Amino acid sequence: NFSKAMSVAKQVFNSLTEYIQGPCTGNQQSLAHSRLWDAVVGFLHVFAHMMMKLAQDSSQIELLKELLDLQKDMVVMLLSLLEGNVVNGMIARQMVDMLVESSSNVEMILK
């Protein structure tokens, strides 16, 4: 079910991670001017509620472990967009808006 879907989702993030690693100015600017931010917000929203639900069931722990490493693949992609970051950078500022919009889900993630 979600096990095969999350496996594909990791590779989508890993490919996105690979494009910007070894800082490429063009690719970072292209991804900044893209619908990736809303795609992250939806994934963050899914990450928030599903972690709470999956933690209750002891037989569904294996799904949570696969879910957890998927979130690790996302944050690496976000940490790669900050390569070559400058003060008040466009890519940095656009990420701040994305965190603000999904601030409700992040609080549960930290919790």
Q: With left for phi above 0 and alpha for psi between -120 and 50, is residue 22 left, alpha or beta?
A: left
DSSP 57: -
Spatial separation of the C-alpha atoms in residues 98 and 41, rounded to whole Å: 7
What phi, psi does 83 have (nearest 5°)?
-70, 135
One-letter amino acid for residue 17 of the chain? T
Spatial separation of the C-alpha atoms in residues 82 and 20, rounded to whole Å: 10
The angle, 0 to 180 degrees and rounded to 10, between the axes of the packed helices 36-56 and 90-101 is: 40
Comparing CA positions, the residue from 38, 36, 33, 18 lying closest to residue 83 is: 18
Q: 23 vs 18, 33, 85, 89, CA distance in Å?
A: 10, 17, 10, 15
Where b means 16+ CB within 10 Å and e means fewer, 2-12 reads eeeeeeebeee
Structure tokens at 105: 């889900």
Q: Tell whether residue 18 is among the known ligand binding residues.
A: yes
Solving technique for this entry? cryo-EM
One-letter amino acid for residue 29 of the chain? Q
3-state helix vs strand vs coil in the chain, percent to 5: 80, 0, 20
SS3 assignment, position 83: coil
